Design a protein around this ligand. Structure first.
Ligand code: ZN
Lengths: 43, 137, 50, 106, 1114, 148, 51
């Protein structure tokens, strides 16, 4: 229902392409300090 | 020279485009701000497109018609007339392939008919919104 | 309008310069003479009606 | 099927195709408007300069349609002599010499 | 009779049979009152107190109050504005005009920063910027130039219910467009089926029930509100969605496509779009329109500029009852309103954004930009260290004002050919511009004359070009409703006694009530005479009501007409096309050197000059102390003296003279409001755009063939039609890369013969006559070092002359121009004058010429006749009367009957009657025709001025009677018989013409379409930039466009080589044009054309688009 | 049937002549000669671009940035966004006003691409090619010459 | 509204009857492309050339 409409809106054209880039970047969330330390040690 | 009889428009290829050009513009500059002379490898470069003045190279090595049809060894601009700046073309070597807009967007879409793809979906392909499979085994 | 125009037509002499110009074929139809003297007639709506 | 082609070309193709095995293509006369008749011409320069320049240009580029430069518009665009009036070869190539009797008189 | 007002008037006898209850208003009130409403001037304050005292509020106050307060997202602080206030202007009008500085005054605003959490007020007086100020004449002065803000007709915000028919169904489909200002629309439509579409923001319709449940109406409340409505209950069944939030989510999906919906977001966004006023504001006019159309509030003040649920549900129910075919309708809490469709062009729905509204809108958008900046910097800046000085940024506001007054289609260049054009450029309504329809978007139905234009907008005067109906002008008596509508005066009649209580109505009250006609028999008591009376109803119908239901009456005739059109005598005899032409070309006359007043005219010759501003008016009564050609010093009754400065030979905005010479003497006593000095086209107070010329109406020798006009040489000898045209040339000595140029006498190669006129330091001496191509400003620039051609080197050394590294670019006067040099105005950086960046010395030279009349200049009377002058005959070969007086011009007869403009005939006849003077010998009573003539008209003097008002003038019988007795000139000689014709003698051959010919005195102007501005030629000149075509426009040499149609015309002839020439070797063959010039000079044959530089540019562009457009040779 | 007819009108077009359909996609973009997109010094030391220089500058900027991104080593998201902008810049260069919004300049004025110079009533194809300003010409107001 | 391309047109007349003699050099890229450059005779030949 509501989640179905969410998934339907997840697949739209978005001809602006800045809105498309924003919906693309919306996929990945933030991180906090300890995982930053872990990533730095790994790299 | 006249003797014009036919004009044949046609889809140009990359090998034709980089055969038309006399150079490869690779810098987004036009004119030096202070001396008001075109930049090297820019959108107005004398080496690529021809001399701004008549029978003069960029460093002024060869300033006479006696020196014509030749290229100055240092600055690289070929010494000729100044009307060649209206005719000589350039080219840009793209680092990634791009699609022409006339054969994708103009209804009826020609890429769509050639590939049997819907434009509502072809737009999702060529603007990096959806994947396609180029080969399945 | 028709009958006013007919009365005006039968009233004028032949040497009258307005009707002399009109009847010569030089310029102008008789309706302009009818509007000059007599009756303007029926005038149209902005939509097209009368 | 459904495509529109010139009557002369249709007849010529039928004369060619009655030989080498005979089969006729069936054709029906059509009355088309002036816009579509003008746009469906043989020369791409004139049609492109008329109307709907983008689509005419792109489908002419696809078809590789070679113009032959024989109308009164494509001869105006490229600046050479038009094929009407004093431009046709019947009048453009007149040899003018003084007459024999008056050449002898001179 | 006469005028009986504006002291110092010429005694101009009037043919006005009726009375004039209301004098014409202050003609320029539409500009001045609007601007002082914007400012909040005390005169406007007391006028508003007289006419609506409850809310005396200026436009700056409104934008400031709607702006105040400004809070951050935290809500812990706020910023507010109050008390707009002006200083005096920094410079007077004339100094502003001379020194190219805009006429402005600073704006001071009291800003207050308030903190919430700790609590302080930071009050200041922030300089908001210079604000342009309108002068006394209704014009702004920007950058020295004079500009006029033209009032704009727009479509007022509100509710507009309209219907269409569907030929596929034959049903009436009704709809509404609730159009706000800067908001989002919503349309409620009834489609082909019996459902109702509620399309909100342009996107894919809606049934009502979704929107009703969105606001919070359950199905039971929808039944209760819409029970009788069959369509509404059908859509309630068709709802296919139950639950308010179930409708809200669908609305959010339809309105936010590509957004994750949440309950709070959908709950708040619908309120945001229509109820949160920051993104939705239908203005004061829109609120008044909606609550008057729907009758929601009656006595309540105008507030809450957003919508409300009551308004929306009332709109829906109004639509459904209007589809039901109801007549009236009561909404709970409001008085009932009639159910009707609304006209898109009725003046109750078409409002007028005047100059004040436009400047207020521009200030509003500038304040919006500044508010965005200020609320950005409220947060980033540290608290307890700031003040409104640090927060306010005035650059976007002044940028918005400067962008409005310069480079906007409504901030038009002031058009001064004659004072009348100055008056009529103002008081002009334009329906095109920003926020209005453009000419390509303009339909045919907007360009007509709705029957609501009567008394609010003249149906005659519109531009004849591609703007007909989009540009018109206000009526004479029109006044502007404070809400932007156009009121009109009317005389109230109660129970059949015509009172004098003049009441102003807009178009709506003109619909409700019923209107009579001024030319009706009032029996000297306010009482009508005949019961059966000419009357207008609501929808433009004309009927015969009895003389008991008439409640309102027109103030006067000529109320429907504009200012310029009211100055046409015998207008009611002219056709509307030729009247339109006469009105449009009455504003194009040029100021002559003499400017003699017309013989026959109207009452608007005097009041269109004292109001236009170009006539100096004695401010307060007194005696003249002293006069000159430069100033008038008046002695007021109480001590004070005042010096009125003139404006001698000042250039207008179109090159015409603007002389002002006094008409008072050293001992005369003047009263307040009296004309004290005539203007460009003024004569003893009243307008004079042309001259009175002796006119015959015969076709003479084919020179007056097809609108051509012949003149006497008499008009050339005595300078009757002769204008003084003043042209302005300018040149600046800027900076450059190689150095700096200098205005000097050290010019490169030119003989010292042409340096005689120049003074010691460049520019010419004052009064030195110049021809085309002469040197005006000696100015030379550096060039650098270019290697010479060898033969130039040899030729230089042969005469020993040096390289002369500098290059001359002097100010040469352009081709086809001559005349004296009046004045030289020179700026400099050394005097510390305001010059743009990188400019050292500016100088302007004013070159004037006395343009006489010639063959080709355009002449015209007041009734749409017009023509180029065919031939200037000598005085002897012109048809002269029996007394030897030659006629001055000869019009054609064949243009008169077919154009239906016989007013020029009548104006001719009365003209002669006004010149010879009449005397009605009332020995045995008064003759029958002269019974209703006013007194002191039974006799008149020679050259006595007269006046016929527009729609009550000389009757034809009265013209016959006046023409019967036209007392002789000097001998016993009645030259013009009772018929109005005379026996002309052929001045060329000698024999008298066999038939009598119409002669009279006609008033004719000189239009600003002179030959010297139009004649143009080019053999070779400048060339265009990207394409190598010749330039054009006559500003350069320029060439004529040999367009596509001429190409077809030459193809049809079979002309091949001429077409090849005109398209190859005269336009684009870059190597071929030098060849054709060489071949012509050397006498050789014209070279064969090559390929044009147009086809090659096309080829290179086609190759640039990845299209291999190759040519195969053969 | 009808879909087959419309497709074959494009498929058979590529089969009859010698055009490979590879030219539909683009690898090297040609640049119009400088004098057809001139940079002129107006009187007053100003400058006037021909409005194609900005589009070419955008294309070169995005292509060079893509080259640097790929050479350095960049994530899939950034590289794909850069490729999409390269596509949009080329699209704007060839035809403005087709996909998305018209690429605007100062004053919110749409830019003039290569298509907007061929197209239009004022484009080369219609006029400035059929009708031209001409030398050896003049104009004047006219009067009647009844003795000629 | 004057304008210039920041260039100068020389009104010189073609002198094809004699030009300074011009030598011709052949440059080659890495990928097998050949280019011919008519360099000046009394001039140095740069082995590395932008082709
Ligand atoms: Zn060099």
């Amino acid at each position: 229902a509501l989640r179905q409409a969410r998934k339907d809106a997840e697949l739209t054209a978005s001809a602006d392409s800045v809105r498309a880039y924003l919906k693309q970047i919306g996929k990945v969330a933030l991180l906090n300090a300890e995982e930053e330390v872990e990533l730095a040690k790994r790299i | 020279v006249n003797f014009f009889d036919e004009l044949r428009i046609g889809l140009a290829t990359a090998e034709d485009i980089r055969q038309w050009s006399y150079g490869e513009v690779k810098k987004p500059e036009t004119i030096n701000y202070r001396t008001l002379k075109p930049e090297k490898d820019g959108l107005f470069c004398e080496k690529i497109f021809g001399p701004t003045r008549d029978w003069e190279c960029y460093c002024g090595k060869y300033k006479r018609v006696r020196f014509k049809g030749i290229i100055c060894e240092r600055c690289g601009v070929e010494v000729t007339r100044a009307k060649v700046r209206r005719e000589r073309m350039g080219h840009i070597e793209l680092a990634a392939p791009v699609t022409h807009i006339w054969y994708f967007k103009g209804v009826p879409s020609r890429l769509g008919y050639l590939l049997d793809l819907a434009p509502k979906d072809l737009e999702k392909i060529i603007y990096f919104a959806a994947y396609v499979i180029t080969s399945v085994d | 309008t028709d009958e006013v125009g007919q009365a005006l037509r039968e009233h004028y002499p032949d040497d009258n310069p307005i009707i002399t110009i009109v009847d010569s074929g030089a310029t102008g139809n008789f309706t302009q003479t009818r509007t000059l003297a007599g009756m303007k007639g029926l005038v149209t709506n902005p939509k097209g009606e009368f | 099927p459904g495509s529109l082609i010139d009557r002369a070309e249709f007849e010529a193709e039928n004369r060619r195709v009655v030989a080498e095995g005979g089969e006729p293509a069936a054709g029906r006369p059509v009355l088309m408007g002036i816009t579509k008749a003008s746009l469906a011409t043989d020369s791409w320069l004139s049609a492109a300069s008329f109307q709907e320049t983008t689509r005419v240009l792109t489908d002419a580029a696809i078809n590789c349609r070679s113009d032959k430069l024989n109308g009164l518009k494509e001869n105006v665009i490229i600046g050479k002599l038009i094929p009407a009036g004093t431009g046709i070869n019947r009048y453009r190539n007149i040899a003018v010499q003084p007459t024999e009797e008056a050449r002898a008189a001179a | 009779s006469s005028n009986n007002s504006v002291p110092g008037a010429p005694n101009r006898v009037s043919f006005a049979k009726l009375r004039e209850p209301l004098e014409v208003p202050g003609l320029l009130d539409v500009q001045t009152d609007s601007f002082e409403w914007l400012i909040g001037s005390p005169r406007w304050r007391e006028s508003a107190a007289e006419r609506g005292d409850v809310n005396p509020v200026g436009g700056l106050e409104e934008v400031l109050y709607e702006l105040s307060p400004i809070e951050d997202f935290s809500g812990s602080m706020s910023l507010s504005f109050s008390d707009p206030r002006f200083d005096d202007v920094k410079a007077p009008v004339d100094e502003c005009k001379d020194k190219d500085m805009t006429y402005a005054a600073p704006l001071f605003v009291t800003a207050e920063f308030i903190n919430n959490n700790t609590g302080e007020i930071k009050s200041q007086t922030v300089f908001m910027g210079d604000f342009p100020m309108m002068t006394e004449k209704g014009t702004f002065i920007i950058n020295g130039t004079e500009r006029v803000v033209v009032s704009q007709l727009v479509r007022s915000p509100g509710v507009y219910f309209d219907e269409t028919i569907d030929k596929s169904t034959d049903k009436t489909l009704h709809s509404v467009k609730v159009i706000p200002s800067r908001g989002a629309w919503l349309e409620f439509d009834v489609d082909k089926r019996d459902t109702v579409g509620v399309r909100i923001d342009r996107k894919r319709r809606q049934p009502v029930t979704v929107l009703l449940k969105a606001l919070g109406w359950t199905s039971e409340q929808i039944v209760e509100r819409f029970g009788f409505s069959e369509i509404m209950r059908s859509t309630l069944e068709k709802d296919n969605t139950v639950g308010t939030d179930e409708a809200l989510l669908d609305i959010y999906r339809k309105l936010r496509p590509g957004e994750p919906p949440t309950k709070e977001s959908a709950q708040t966004l619908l309120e945001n779009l229509f109820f949160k006023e920051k993104r939705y504001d239908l203005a004061r006019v829109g609120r008044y329109k909606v609550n008057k159309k729907l009758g929601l509030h009656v006595g309540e003040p105008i507030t809450s500029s957003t919508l409300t649920e009551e308004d929306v549900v009332a709109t829906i129910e109004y639509l459904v009852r209007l589809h039901e075919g109801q007549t009236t309708m009561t909404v709970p809490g409001g008085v009932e309103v009639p159910v009707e469709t609304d006209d898109i062009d009725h003046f109750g729905n078409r409002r007028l954004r005047t100059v004040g509204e436009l400047i207020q809108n521009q200030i509003r958008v500038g304040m919006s930009r500044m508010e965005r900046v200020v609320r950005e910097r409220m947060t980033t800046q540290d608290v307890e260290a700031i003040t409104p000085q640090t927060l306010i940024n005035i650059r976007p506001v002044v940028a918005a004002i400067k962008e409005f007054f310069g480079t906007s289609q409504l901030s038009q260049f002031m058009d001064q050919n004659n004072p009348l054009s100055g008056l009529t450029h103002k008081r002009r309504l334009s329906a095109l511009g920003p926020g209005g329809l453009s000419r390509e978007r303009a339909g045919l139905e907007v360009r007509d004359v709705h029957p609501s234009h009567y008394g609010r907008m003249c149906p005659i005067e519109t531009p004849e070009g591609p703007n007909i109906g989009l540009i018109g002008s206000l009526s004479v008596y029109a006044r502007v409703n404070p809400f932007g509508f156009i009121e009109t005066p009317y005389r109230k009649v109660v129970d059949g006694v015509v009172s004098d209580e003049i009441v102003y109505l807009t178009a709506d009250e003109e619909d409700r009530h019923v209107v009579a006609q001024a030319n009706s028999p009032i029996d000297a008591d306010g009482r009508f005479v005949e019961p059966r009376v000419l009357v207008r109803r609501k929808a433009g119908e004309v009927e015969y009501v009895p003389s008991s239901e008439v409640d309102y009456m027109d103030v006067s005739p000529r109320q429907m007409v504009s200012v310029a059109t009211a100055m046409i005598p015998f207008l009611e005899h002219d056709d509307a096309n030729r009247a339109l032409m006469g009105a449009n070309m009455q504003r194009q006359a040029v100021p002559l050197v003499r400017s003699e007043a017309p013989l026959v005219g109207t009452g608007m010759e005097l009041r269109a000059a004292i109001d236009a501003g170009d006539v100096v008016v004695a401010e307060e009564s007194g005696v003249i102390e002293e006069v000159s050609a430069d100033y008038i010093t008046v002695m007021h009754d109480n001590g004070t003296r005042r010096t009125y400065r003139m404006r001698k030979f000042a250039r207008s905005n179109h090159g015409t003279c603007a002389n002002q010479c006094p008409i008072v003497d050293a001992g005369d006593r003047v009263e307040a409001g009296q004309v004290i000095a005539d203007g460009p086209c003024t004569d003893d107070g009243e307008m004079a755009l042309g001259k009175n010329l002796l006119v015959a109406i015969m076709p003479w020798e084919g020179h007056n063939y097809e609108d051509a006009i012949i003149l006497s040489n008499r008009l050339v000898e005595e300078d009757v039609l002769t204008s003084i045209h003043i042209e302005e040339h300018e040149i600046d000595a800027r900076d450059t890369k190689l150095g700096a140029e200098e205005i000097t006498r050290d010019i490169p190669n030119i003989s010292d013969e042409v340096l005689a006129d120049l003074d010691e330091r460049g520019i010419v001496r004052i009064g030195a006559e110049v021809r085309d191509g002469d040197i005006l400003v000696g100015k030379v620039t550096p060039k650098g070092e270019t290697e010479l051609t060898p033969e130039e080197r040899l030729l230089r050394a042969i005469f020993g002359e040096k390289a002369r590294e500098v290059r001359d670019t002097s100010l040469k006067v352009p081709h086809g121009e001559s005349g004296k040099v009046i004045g030289i105005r020179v700026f400099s950086r050394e005097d510390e004058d305001e010059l743009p960046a990188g400019v050292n010395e500016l100088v302007r030279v004013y070159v004037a010429q006395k343009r006489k009349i010639s063959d080709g200049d355009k002449l015209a009377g007041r009734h749409g006749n017009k023509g180029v002058i065919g031939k200037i005959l000598p005085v002897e070969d012109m048809p002269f009367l029996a007394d030897g007086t030659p006629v001055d011009i000869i019009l054609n007869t064949h243009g008169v009957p077919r154009r239906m403009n016989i007013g020029q005939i009548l104006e001719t006849h009365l003209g002669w009657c006004a010149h010879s003077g009449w005397k009605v010998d009332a020995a045995k009573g008064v003759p029958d025709w002269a019974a209703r003539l006013p007194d002191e008209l039974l006799e008149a003097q020679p050259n006595a001025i007269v006046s016929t008002p527009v729609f009550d003038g000389a009757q034809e019988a009265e013209l016959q009677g006046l023409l019967s007795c036209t007392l002789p000139n000097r001998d016993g000689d009645v030259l013009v018989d009772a018929d109005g014709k005379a026996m002309l003698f052929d001045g060329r051959s000698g024999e008298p013409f066999p038939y009598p010919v119409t002669v009279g005195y006609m008033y004719i102007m000189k239009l600003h379409h002179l030959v010297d501005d139009k004649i143009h030629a080019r053999s070779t000149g400048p060339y265009s930039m990207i394409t190598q075509q010749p330039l054009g426009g006559k500003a350069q040499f320029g060439g004529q466009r040999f367009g596509e149609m001429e190409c077809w015309a030459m193809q049809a002839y079979g002309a091949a080589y001429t077409l090849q020439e005109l398209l190859t070797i005269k336009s684009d063959d870059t190597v071929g044009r030098v060849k054709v010039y060489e071949a012509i000079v050397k006498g050789e044959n014209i070279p064969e054309p090559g390929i044009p530089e147009s086809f090659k540019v096309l080829l290179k562009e086609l190759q640039s688009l990845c299209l291999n457009v190759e040519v195969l040779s053969s | 049937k009808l879909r087959a007819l419309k497709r074959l009108k494009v498929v058979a077009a590529f089969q009859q002549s010698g055009n490979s359909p590879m030219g539909m996609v683009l690898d090297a973009v040609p640049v119009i000669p400088p004098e057809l997109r001139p940079m002129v010094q107006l009187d007053g030391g100003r400058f006037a671009t021909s409005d194609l220089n900005d589009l070419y500058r955008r294309v070169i900027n995005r292509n060079n940035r893509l080259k640097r991104l790929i050479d350095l080593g960049a994530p899939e998201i950034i590289v794909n966004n850069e490729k999409r902008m390269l596509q949009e810049s080329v699209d704007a260069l060839f035809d403005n006003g087709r996909r998305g919004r018209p690429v605007t300049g100062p004053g919110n004025r749409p830019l003039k691409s290569l298509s907007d110079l061929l197209k239009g009533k004022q484009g080369r194809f219609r006029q400035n090619l059929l009708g031209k300003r001409v030398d050896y010409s003049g104009r004047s107001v006219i009067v009647v010459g009844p003795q000629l | 509204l004057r304008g210039s391309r920041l260039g100068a047109v020389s009104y010189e007349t073609d002198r094809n009857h004699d030009l300074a003699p011009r030598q011709i050099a052949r440059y080659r890229t890495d990928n097998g492309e050949e280019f011919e450059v008519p360099f000046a005779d009394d001039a140095e030949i740069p082995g590395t050339w932008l082709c």
